[PDB]
Amino acid sequence: INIGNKTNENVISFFDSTDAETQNHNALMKGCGEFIVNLRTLLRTFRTITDNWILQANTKTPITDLTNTTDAQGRDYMSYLSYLYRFYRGGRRYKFFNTTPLKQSQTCYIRSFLIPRNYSADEINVDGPSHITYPVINPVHEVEVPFYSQYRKIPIASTSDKGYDSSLMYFSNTATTQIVARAGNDDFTFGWMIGPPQLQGESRSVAP
Amino acid sequence: SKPRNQQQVCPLQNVPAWGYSLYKGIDMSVPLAYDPNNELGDLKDVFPSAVDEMAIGYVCGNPAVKHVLTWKTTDAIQKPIANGDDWGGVIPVGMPCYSKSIRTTRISATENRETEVMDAAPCEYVANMFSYWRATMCYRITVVKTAFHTGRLEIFFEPGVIPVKPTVNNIGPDQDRLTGAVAPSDNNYKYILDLTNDTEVTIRVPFVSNKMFLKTAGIYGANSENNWNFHESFSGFLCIRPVTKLMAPDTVSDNVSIVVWKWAEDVVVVEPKPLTSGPTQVYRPPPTASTAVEVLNVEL
Amino acid sequence: SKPRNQQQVCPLQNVPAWGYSLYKGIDMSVPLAYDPNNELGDLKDVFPSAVDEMAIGYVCGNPAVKHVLTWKTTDAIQKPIANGDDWGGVIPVGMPCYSKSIRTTRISATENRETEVMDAAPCEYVANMFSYWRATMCYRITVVKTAFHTGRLEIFFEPGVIPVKPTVNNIGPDQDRLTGAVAPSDNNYKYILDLTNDTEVTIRVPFVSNKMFLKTAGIYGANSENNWNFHESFSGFLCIRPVTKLMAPDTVSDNVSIVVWKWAEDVVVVEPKPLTSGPTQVYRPPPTASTAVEVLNVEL
Amino acid sequence: SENSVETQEITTFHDVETPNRIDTPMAQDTSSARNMDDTHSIIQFLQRPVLIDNIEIIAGTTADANKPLSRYVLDQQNSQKYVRSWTLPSTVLRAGGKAQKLANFKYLRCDVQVKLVLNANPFVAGRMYLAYSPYDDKVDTARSVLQTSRAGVTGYPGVELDFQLDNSVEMTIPYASFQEAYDLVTGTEDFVQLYLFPITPVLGPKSESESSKVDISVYMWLSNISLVIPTYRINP
């Protein structure tokens, strides 16, 4: 009753029919089947990051010409959980779906290579671990970049250091417009939780 | 020594990347490496925690401040705090978002763009990914008082439809229906905290409303036109209205603060797609107010 | 006796040569032979050694001379040997190359071609293949003296950034900063050899600089413009500067020789691709100085 | 007679013979400085708390120290308003004369402690929040603490800073960098960058000539340190 303050923490509860963990199994067994637990499992599913990427013919294009753009939006699960965390380790699987009006007077093919991060086009070589597909017989390019880093983990959008882990270079022959989808590899995981930034809603843009 | 073929004709379907949107099953992505058995190590000595930092039991178990209230001697009793918050005294129980702020820029002399900007608790931020939810909510209401402020404060649940005010661009709660003597608090689940020496309380609200899962639309596109999804997303509201008025001497200040924290335990979700009529666009703050934000569209 | 098909539909993707750049996994190359079980013998009686001659523990464990120094009575004390070597007294610890010579031919009346030609230790020559390295270095410094030359010679490590001089086409070390009394050698790891009767020393330098792997760029494209990769490739330098001046009578010669050997133990590497901005072109010496070398380009 | 290789701290010699060394006849103990204090190691010396900052708040308030946390941040001009910004470990290393005691070393593996001694009168209420954000001025603009909403600021790690319940906080800011063992010579360390936010405005009687003060102070010291490679340089 005296003049002062205490803390006396009270976890007082409302409705207390049954244990919560028991009803959640019974609720998902009749409504879902699938039981989503860990967000590490959502970095294994290939969500499409773009719908159209019109690549100019005969140019060794790094994916960082698209990754700097498409890590802002958070459309996929890699860049939407780029805001709840700070570090990451693990390689990024990429799949490329061809959507080109192909022409019979050419033999279309697709290459792929490695560059370290954030280098430009001409300042890297080409003999490395490669992969090749032929989109007449195989429209999907099934490529996984490994995790070849100097450091054990990487923060997002670092300082003036560059070329400290590896990523993809994408070479074609014809002006192939595609779909690009991605997720992390088997050992891709974030860490070091922070609080989340904001969200953006609908932009109907009424006149007055 | 070179016999004939004894195996049957293996049937065939040409499906490149069969079922790519599943977290299980061996995938045909070619590693650009030296070794096919490319094995990174475990999670030892990399991230400086030992807590598994990605389980939804831990991501949504992260407390965030939602409301900061100003409870005055001017304010009456048996009536929630109407402050132009605008929710404030009526906190909707439920995991997805319920609030929004509207950014009004200019394009031409008679056309503008109203972009909805939402706040994001970490319980809210996960739920935007998924479509249908089910979670046991939590709230830790704390009074920021001196040694001399006393009083009795009531927090009571109410299941079902939240009273609202549809406007041209937002939904505000309706304090005309929660006053009186026209909405008693004698049959609801309630807690009557005491400002004499008790300060904090945590009010766990389990999930009960006539359906197996609610929706994660929340406040996206909630207005005079499209407000069905806002009703079918919460299972009601807490309501903080005072039983007894604030007793404060002239020395201490007449304004106290009520900070409403929020998280969600035992969270389960249904589909890995957004139920909203737009992609998961993360709001990037513009440098100058005359600049607008790029809008993601729905063509393929 | 001829029943119906019971097997499911086997899914399909048409990938000829799936994952060809891996040293493991059964490959579909057709042998042009008589027997499918074409088995060459083991390594018995073929190569006249019994040492496994391709392991990186043995290839990089091959000693090579890097520097031949001339240490004079004219040269001062507490200052490294600046001889126009130009590195000489400042040997950068690290596996990839650090030196280059420039070949200047003529094309037109006002245009020339400057081709960088590097020396190659066998520890250096392996590292050009790979991108990122990590290795415990070794150096065997030997004094070529008479029976009458004496003195005390100091070799001290220094971790981090090597002092340099960026020029138009090469990087030279900076002996203005390693002299004095402006750069003491009292806190570094050091060894003080004695020229009285001791001759040789092997100075093993393990790998310590704040990263899991350095880079294998070295001196390729190292100039006034592009010299970030040269700093992030070494973890510092040894430095051979004399404590006490060379004492030599008039009978014996005033010049002694210091031969710096080099290899690398416990070598591990990361990627099988060159980090440099060019393919692994091996320098072929032209017959006459007026002839130039074919240059590998980057188109496909 | 042939093998004279002796070892100092980090230093080795190579002579022909052991150079006929003479020494003390008997090493008798002398004046009692050993009996007055035990020797403080260099890992023991970088665990002393230092008085860094002394923050005074009056409500008030004309100044920025009681602008409350914004519910929404719509543009980068109207960023989140704070009290002070400590850019660790470049603040804790320079202050307290520590950097003139870890000279001639190269790499450091520290954990920064932070304590807030707080001392205010009973007639004043309020609440603050002490958040830290690594790479807060290195990452892209949208990911910093100063651009997110009030629910996003508080969702960062930290501790409550209520007046009447908490006269002391203990926060352990971990080794939170990607580089192994912080560089010192030519240092641009600034990895974890601390903040101090007021959630509610500080409240007192609106009649003035009353002096409602707060008077926060900040103590920092390192922990779990390892200091390894010797050099000859250092940054001034």
GROMACS .gro file of N, CA, C and O in nm, chain D residues 71-118:
model
  192
  879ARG      N    1   0.459   0.686  -3.529
  879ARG     CA    2   0.382   0.565  -3.556
  879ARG      C    3   0.409   0.514  -3.698
  879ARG      O    4   0.414   0.394  -3.720
  880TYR      N    5   0.426   0.607  -3.792
  880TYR     CA    6   0.463   0.572  -3.929
  880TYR      C    7   0.574   0.664  -3.975
  880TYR      O    8   0.583   0.779  -3.934
  881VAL      N    9   0.660   0.611  -4.062
  881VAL     CA   10   0.765   0.688  -4.126
  881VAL      C   11   0.737   0.683  -4.275
  881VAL      O   12   0.760   0.581  -4.341
  882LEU      N   13   0.686   0.793  -4.329
  882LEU     CA   14   0.642   0.798  -4.468
  882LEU      C   15   0.752   0.840  -4.566
  882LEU      O   16   0.741   0.811  -4.684
  883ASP      N   17   0.854   0.911  -4.517
  883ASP     CA   18   0.961   0.960  -4.604
  883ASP      C   19   1.089   0.980  -4.524
  883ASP      O   20   1.085   0.998  -4.402
  884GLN      N   21   1.201   0.977  -4.595
  884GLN     CA   22   1.332   0.976  -4.530
  884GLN      C   23   1.370   1.109  -4.465
  884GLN      O   24   1.458   1.111  -4.379
  885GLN      N   25   1.307   1.218  -4.505
  885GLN     CA   26   1.324   1.347  -4.435
  885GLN      C   27   1.269   1.339  -4.293
  885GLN      O   28   1.335   1.382  -4.199
  886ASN      N   29   1.149   1.283  -4.279
  886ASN     CA   30   1.090   1.262  -4.147
  886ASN      C   31   1.131   1.125  -4.095
  886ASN      O   32   1.047   1.037  -4.071
  887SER      N   33   1.261   1.108  -4.074
  887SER     CA   34   1.317   0.984  -4.021
  887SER      C   35   1.282   0.971  -3.873
  887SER      O   36   1.220   1.060  -3.814
  888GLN      N   37   1.321   0.859  -3.813
  888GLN     CA   38   1.291   0.836  -3.673
  888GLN      C   39   1.381   0.921  -3.585
  888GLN      O   40   1.502   0.925  -3.606
  889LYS      N   41   1.322   0.988  -3.487
  889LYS     CA   42   1.396   1.079  -3.399
  889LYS      C   43   1.441   1.007  -3.273
  889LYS      O   44   1.363   0.934  -3.210
  890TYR      N   45   1.567   1.029  -3.236
  890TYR     CA   46   1.634   0.955  -3.129
  890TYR      C   47   1.698   1.053  -3.030
  890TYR      O   48   1.673   1.174  -3.037
  891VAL      N   49   1.778   1.001  -2.938
  891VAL     CA   50   1.849   1.085  -2.842
  891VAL      C   51   1.996   1.095  -2.881
  891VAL      O   52   2.043   1.203  -2.916
  892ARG      N   53   2.068   0.982  -2.873
  892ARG     CA   54   2.210   0.975  -2.909
  892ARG      C   55   2.236   0.853  -2.994
  892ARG      O   56   2.152   0.763  -3.003
  893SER      N   57   2.353   0.850  -3.057
  893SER     CA   58   2.394   0.740  -3.143
  893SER      C   59   2.535   0.697  -3.108
  893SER      O   60   2.629   0.774  -3.127
  894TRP      N   61   2.549   0.576  -3.056
  894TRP     CA   62   2.681   0.521  -3.025
  894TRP      C   63   2.717   0.418  -3.131
  894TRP      O   64   2.648   0.318  -3.146
  895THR      N   65   2.827   0.443  -3.200
  895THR     CA   66   2.870   0.360  -3.312
  895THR      C   67   2.981   0.267  -3.264
  895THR      O   68   3.100   0.292  -3.284
  896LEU      N   69   2.939   0.158  -3.200
  896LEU     CA   70   3.030   0.060  -3.141
  896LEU      C   71   3.110  -0.017  -3.246
  896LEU      O   72   3.068  -0.028  -3.360
  897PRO      N   73   3.230  -0.066  -3.209
  897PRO     CA   74   3.305  -0.044  -3.085
  897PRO      C   75   3.398   0.078  -3.094
  897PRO      O   76   3.486   0.094  -3.010
  898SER      N   77   3.378   0.164  -3.194
  898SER     CA   78   3.466   0.278  -3.214
  898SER      C   79   3.449   0.387  -3.108
  898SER      O   80   3.530   0.478  -3.100
  899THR      N   81   3.342   0.380  -3.028
  899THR     CA   82   3.326   0.471  -2.915
  899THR      C   83   3.392   0.414  -2.789
  899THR      O   84   3.463   0.487  -2.719
  900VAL      N   85   3.368   0.287  -2.761
  900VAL     CA   86   3.419   0.224  -2.639
  900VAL      C   87   3.571   0.204  -2.643
  900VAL      O   88   3.636   0.201  -2.539
  901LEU      N   89   3.628   0.193  -2.763
  901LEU     CA   90   3.773   0.174  -2.773
  901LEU      C   91   3.851   0.303  -2.755
  901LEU      O   92   3.959   0.302  -2.696
  902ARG      N   93   3.798   0.415  -2.804
  902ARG     CA   94   3.869   0.542  -2.793
  902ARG      C   95   3.862   0.599  -2.652
  902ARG      O   96   3.961   0.655  -2.602
  903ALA      N   97   3.747   0.584  -2.587
  903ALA     CA   98   3.726   0.641  -2.454
  903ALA      C   99   3.787   0.554  -2.346
  903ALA      O  100   3.810   0.435  -2.365
  904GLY      N  101   3.813   0.616  -2.231
  904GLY     CA  102   3.870   0.548  -2.116
  904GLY      C  103   4.017   0.514  -2.127
  904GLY      O  104   4.070   0.438  -2.045
  905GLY      N  105   4.085   0.571  -2.228
  905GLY     CA  106   4.226   0.543  -2.253
  905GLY      C  107   4.258   0.399  -2.291
  905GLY      O  108   4.370   0.354  -2.270
  906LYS      N  109   4.161   0.327  -2.347
  906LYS     CA  110   4.181   0.187  -2.383
  906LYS      C  111   4.267   0.173  -2.508
  906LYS      O  112   4.352   0.084  -2.514
  907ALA      N  113   4.247   0.260  -2.606
  907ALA     CA  114   4.321   0.252  -2.732
  907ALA      C  115   4.470   0.283  -2.716
  907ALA      O  116   4.550   0.238  -2.797
  908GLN      N  117   4.506   0.358  -2.613
  908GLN     CA  118   4.646   0.375  -2.575
  908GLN      C  119   4.694   0.265  -2.479
  908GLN      O  120   4.797   0.281  -2.413
  909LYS      N  121   4.618   0.156  -2.469
  909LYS     CA  122   4.659   0.036  -2.396
  909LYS      C  123   4.642  -0.094  -2.475
  909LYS      O  124   4.689  -0.197  -2.429
  910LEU      N  125   4.575  -0.088  -2.590
  910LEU     CA  126   4.574  -0.199  -2.685
  910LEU      C  127   4.643  -0.162  -2.816
  910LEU      O  128   4.614  -0.220  -2.921
  911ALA      N  129   4.735  -0.066  -2.811
  911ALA     CA  130   4.824  -0.039  -2.923
  911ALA      C  131   4.923  -0.154  -2.940
  911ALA      O  132   4.946  -0.232  -2.846
  912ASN      N  133   4.982  -0.162  -3.059
  912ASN     CA  134   5.069  -0.273  -3.100
  912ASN      C  135   5.002  -0.410  -3.088
  912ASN      O  136   5.065  -0.509  -3.051
  913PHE      N  137   4.872  -0.414  -3.118
  913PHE     CA  138   4.799  -0.538  -3.144
  913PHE      C  139   4.722  -0.519  -3.274
  913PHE      O  140   4.713  -0.408  -3.325
  914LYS      N  141   4.666  -0.627  -3.327
  914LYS     CA  142   4.603  -0.621  -3.458
  914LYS      C  143   4.455  -0.660  -3.457
  914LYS      O  144   4.373  -0.586  -3.512
  915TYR      N  145   4.422  -0.775  -3.399
  915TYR     CA  146   4.287  -0.831  -3.408
  915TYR      C  147   4.221  -0.846  -3.273
  915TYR      O  148   4.287  -0.881  -3.175
  916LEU      N  149   4.090  -0.822  -3.270
  916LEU     CA  150   4.013  -0.815  -3.146
  916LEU      C  151   3.880  -0.887  -3.161
  916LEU      O  152   3.813  -0.872  -3.263
  917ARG      N  153   3.843  -0.964  -3.059
  917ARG     CA  154   3.716  -1.038  -3.057
  917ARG      C  155   3.639  -1.004  -2.930
  917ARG      O  156   3.644  -1.079  -2.832
  918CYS      N  157   3.566  -0.893  -2.933
  918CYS     CA  158   3.505  -0.836  -2.812
  918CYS      C  159   3.354  -0.855  -2.807
  918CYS      O  160   3.290  -0.882  -2.909
  919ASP      N  161   3.300  -0.841  -2.687
  919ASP     CA  162   3.156  -0.828  -2.664
  919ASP      C  163   3.133  -0.707  -2.576
  919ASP      O  164   3.180  -0.703  -2.462
  920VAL      N  165   3.059  -0.610  -2.627
  920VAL     CA  166   3.041  -0.483  -2.559
  920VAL      C  167   2.926  -0.494  -2.460
  920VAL      O  168   2.815  -0.529  -2.498
  921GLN      N  169   2.954  -0.465  -2.333
  921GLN     CA  170   2.849  -0.451  -2.233
  921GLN      C  171   2.799  -0.307  -2.235
  921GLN      O  172   2.873  -0.215  -2.269
  922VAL      N  173   2.672  -0.288  -2.200
  922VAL     CA  174   2.614  -0.155  -2.184
  922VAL      C  175   2.530  -0.156  -2.057
  922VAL      O  176   2.444  -0.242  -2.040
  923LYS      N  177   2.556  -0.060  -1.968
  923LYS     CA  178   2.475  -0.039  -1.849
  923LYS      C  179   2.430   0.106  -1.842
  923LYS      O  180   2.508   0.196  -1.871
  924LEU      N  181   2.304   0.127  -1.804
  924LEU     CA  182   2.250   0.261  -1.784
  924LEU      C  183   2.213   0.283  -1.639
  924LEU      O  184   2.110   0.235  -1.591
  925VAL      N  185   2.296   0.359  -1.568
  925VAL     CA  186   2.260   0.409  -1.437
  925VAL      C  187   2.162   0.524  -1.460
  925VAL      O  188   2.186   0.612  -1.543
  926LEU      N  189   2.050   0.521  -1.388
  926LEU     CA  190   1.941   0.617  -1.405
  926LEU      C  191   1.900   0.671  -1.270
  926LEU      O  192   1.895   0.596  -1.172
   0.00000   0.00000   0.00000
